[PDB]
């Protein structure tokens, strides 16, 4: 499960735990990816470091899969790749559009 081998794939622990556990850590761009009850797409739990007083902003995204290489997995309407990790890498290696993009792999 290449995903489970990354520094962000959290077991069956829903993003709530990933978020709860991850958000508690407060890792700038801290992310993780777990398999949703609907074992079809991978859910990535990410935490963004916010300056505001309200505290940092952490968010998760369910990786959307497709039937076109590499546009297979995507957690955005254009970010589709045959590799969540790559896409994970893309979620940071490229401008991105989600909470300070993927930064730290806080695999729950």
């Amino acid at each position: 499960n290449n995903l489970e081998t990354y520094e962000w794939y959290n077991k069956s622990i829903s993003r709530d735990k990933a978020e709860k556990l991850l958000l508690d850590t407060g890792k700038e761009g801290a992310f993780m990816v777990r398999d949703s009850r609907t074992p079809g797409t991978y859910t990535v739990s990410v935490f963004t470091k916010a300056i505001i007083s309200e505290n940092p902003c952490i968010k998760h995204y369910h990786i959307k899969e497709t039937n076109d290489s590499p546009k297979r997995y995507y957690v955005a309407e254009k970010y589709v790749f045959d590799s969540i990790p790559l896409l994970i890498q893309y979620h940071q290696y490229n401008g991105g559009g989600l909470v300070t993009r993927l930064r730290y792999p806080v695999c729950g």
């Binding site: 859910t43 968010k59 998760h60 995204y61 369910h62 995507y74 559009g97 989600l98």
Partner: peptide, 6 residues
């Protein structure tokens, strides 16, 4: 939509 609408 529910899951942090990427």
């Amino acid at each position: 939509a529910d899951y942090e609408p990427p």
